[PDB]
Design an enzyme around this catalytic site. Structure first.
Site, short mmCIF file in Angstrom:
data_model
loop_
_atom_site.label_atom_id
_atom_site.label_comp_id
_atom_site.label_asym_id
_atom_site.label_seq_id
_atom_site.Cartn_x
_atom_site.Cartn_y
_atom_site.Cartn_z
N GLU A 129 4.55 -6.44 10.46
CA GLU A 129 4.43 -5.02 10.51
C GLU A 129 3.23 -4.98 9.31
O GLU A 129 3.60 -5.34 7.98
CB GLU A 129 5.57 -4.47 9.96
CG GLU A 129 5.51 -2.91 9.55
CD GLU A 129 6.89 -2.38 9.03
OE1 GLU A 129 7.65 -2.99 8.61
OE2 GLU A 129 6.64 -0.98 9.44
N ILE A 130 2.20 -4.06 9.70
CA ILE A 130 1.54 -3.91 8.71
C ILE A 130 1.93 -2.48 7.91
O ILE A 130 1.81 -1.52 8.58
CB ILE A 130 -0.08 -3.53 9.00
CG1 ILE A 130 -0.60 -4.90 9.39
CG2 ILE A 130 -0.90 -2.90 8.09
CD1 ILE A 130 -2.15 -4.96 10.17
N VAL A 131 2.49 -2.57 6.84
CA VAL A 131 3.03 -1.35 6.08
C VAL A 131 2.35 -0.66 5.47
O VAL A 131 2.16 0.86 5.50
CB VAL A 131 4.13 -1.90 4.96
CG1 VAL A 131 5.10 -0.86 4.53
CG2 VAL A 131 4.98 -3.25 5.56
N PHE B 35 7.30 -11.58 10.37
CA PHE B 35 8.43 -11.93 11.04
C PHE B 35 8.03 -13.28 11.84
O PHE B 35 7.80 -13.12 12.96
CB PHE B 35 9.18 -10.80 11.79
CG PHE B 35 9.56 -9.68 11.17
CD1 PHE B 35 10.70 -9.53 10.48
CD2 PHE B 35 8.61 -8.61 11.05
CE1 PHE B 35 11.08 -8.50 9.82
CE2 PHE B 35 9.06 -7.26 10.48
CZ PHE B 35 10.11 -7.42 9.79
N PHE C 86 5.40 -11.77 14.81
CA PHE C 86 4.50 -10.67 14.82
C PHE C 86 4.87 -10.12 13.18
O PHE C 86 5.75 -10.68 12.54
CB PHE C 86 5.14 -9.41 15.72
CG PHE C 86 6.13 -8.51 15.10
CD1 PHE C 86 7.37 -9.02 15.62
CD2 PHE C 86 6.22 -7.47 14.32
CE1 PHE C 86 8.50 -8.20 14.90
CE2 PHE C 86 7.05 -6.76 14.07
CZ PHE C 86 8.45 -7.11 14.22
N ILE D 15 11.34 -2.88 12.26
CA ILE D 15 10.44 -2.06 11.63
C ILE D 15 10.79 -0.53 11.75
O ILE D 15 11.48 -0.19 12.76
CB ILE D 15 9.06 -2.18 12.36
CG1 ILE D 15 9.09 -1.55 13.63
CG2 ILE D 15 8.52 -3.72 12.22
CD1 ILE D 15 7.87 -1.39 14.41
N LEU E 283 1.90 -4.92 14.27
CA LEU E 283 2.22 -3.56 14.76
C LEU E 283 2.27 -2.93 13.40
O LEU E 283 2.79 -3.36 12.14
CB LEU E 283 3.66 -3.50 14.89
CG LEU E 283 4.22 -4.19 16.55
CD1 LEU E 283 5.60 -4.10 16.71
CD2 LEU E 283 3.50 -3.15 17.41
N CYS F 269 -2.07 0.09 4.36
CA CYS F 269 -3.52 -0.27 4.22
C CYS F 269 -4.53 0.71 3.71
O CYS F 269 -4.34 1.73 3.81
CB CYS F 269 -4.04 -0.42 5.59
SG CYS F 269 -5.70 -1.41 5.78
N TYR G 283 9.74 6.08 9.09
CA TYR G 283 10.41 7.26 8.25
C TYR G 283 9.39 8.40 8.19
O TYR G 283 9.68 9.71 7.84
CB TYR G 283 10.85 6.81 6.78
CG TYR G 283 12.03 5.81 6.88
CD1 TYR G 283 13.14 5.90 7.35
CD2 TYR G 283 11.81 4.53 6.43
CE1 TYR G 283 14.06 5.01 7.41
CE2 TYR G 283 12.70 3.61 6.44
CZ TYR G 283 13.84 4.04 6.95
OH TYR G 283 14.86 2.96 7.09
#
Length: 164
Positions: free
Chosen positions: A75-77, A68, A73, A143, A112, A79, A146
Site C-alpha cells: 500500500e502506498i500510504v 505485504f 502487494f 488497507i 495500491l 507520496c 479514512y
C-alpha cells in the site's frame, strides 16, 4: 548528488532524521489529515519509506509504503515531493526507483493507494489506474481509507534479483 534511500524506524538516529524530514513534508502537503496519524504511520516499523535525499541529509521528497510480501502487494500510504524542490523529474524518478527496489528485494508485484484528489494525475502518469483488477480478497481489510480517497492500482512485472 541525489540519493534514493529506503529507511524505516529501526531505532537509529539517522533513520529517524530521514523519517522525520519526510513526515514534515507529508504533514505540510496533507494538512486536512490528522498530523499525529501521519506521524504514527511513518514511524511505524512495519512501514518502509523511500526518501529522495540531497547530500548531506536533506530530504526533498519520498514515499511511505506498507509491504505485504506474502500477498504480493504494498500500500502506498504517502507520496510527495517538497514544494521547494520543484525540479523536473523528482516525482517520476522517485516512483521509478521504488518500483525497481521492490521488484529486486521483495515479491511485491502490485501497488495500491487511496489517492487524494490532487495526486490522481501524478499516479496516472506513473502507470496507476482507477480500474482495480486485484481481487478484493487480497487487499480487503489490509488497507484502510479514512480520507475517502480514490483507490488506484499499479501492476508491475515479477521479481528480478534474488539471493536470500
Amino acid at each position: 548528488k541525489i540519493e534514493f534511500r529506503v529507511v524505516n524506524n529501526d531505532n537509529t538516529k539517522e533513520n529517524m532524521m530521514v523519517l522525520t524530514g519526510l513526515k514534515n513534508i507529508f504533514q505540510k502537503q496533507l494538512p486536512k489529515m490528522p498530523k499525529e496519524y501521519i506521524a504514527r504511520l511513518v514511524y511505524d516499523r512495519s512501514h518502509l519509506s523511500m526518501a529522495v535525499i540531497r547530500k548531506p541529509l536533506t530530504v526533498v521528497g519520498g514515499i511511505t509504503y506498507r509491504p505485504f510480501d506474502k500477498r504480493e502487494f504494498a500500500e502506498i500510504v504517502f507520496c510527495a515531493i517538497s514544494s521547494t524542490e520543484q525540479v523536473r523529474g523528482y516525482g517520476a524518478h522517485l516512483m521509478n526507483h521504488l518500483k525497481d527496489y521492490v521488484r529486486n528485494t521483495s515479491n511485491i508485484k502490485y501497488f495500491l493507494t487511496y489517492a487524494d484528489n490532487y495526486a490522481i494525475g501524478y499516479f496516472k502518469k506513473q502507470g496507476f489506474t482507477k480500474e482495480i483488477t486485484l481481487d478484493k480478497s487480497i487487499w480487503m481489510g489490509y488497507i484502510k481509507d479514512y480520507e475517502g480517497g480514490t483507490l488506484m492500482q499499479c501492476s508491475m512485472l515479477p521479481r528480478i534479483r534474488y539471493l536470500d
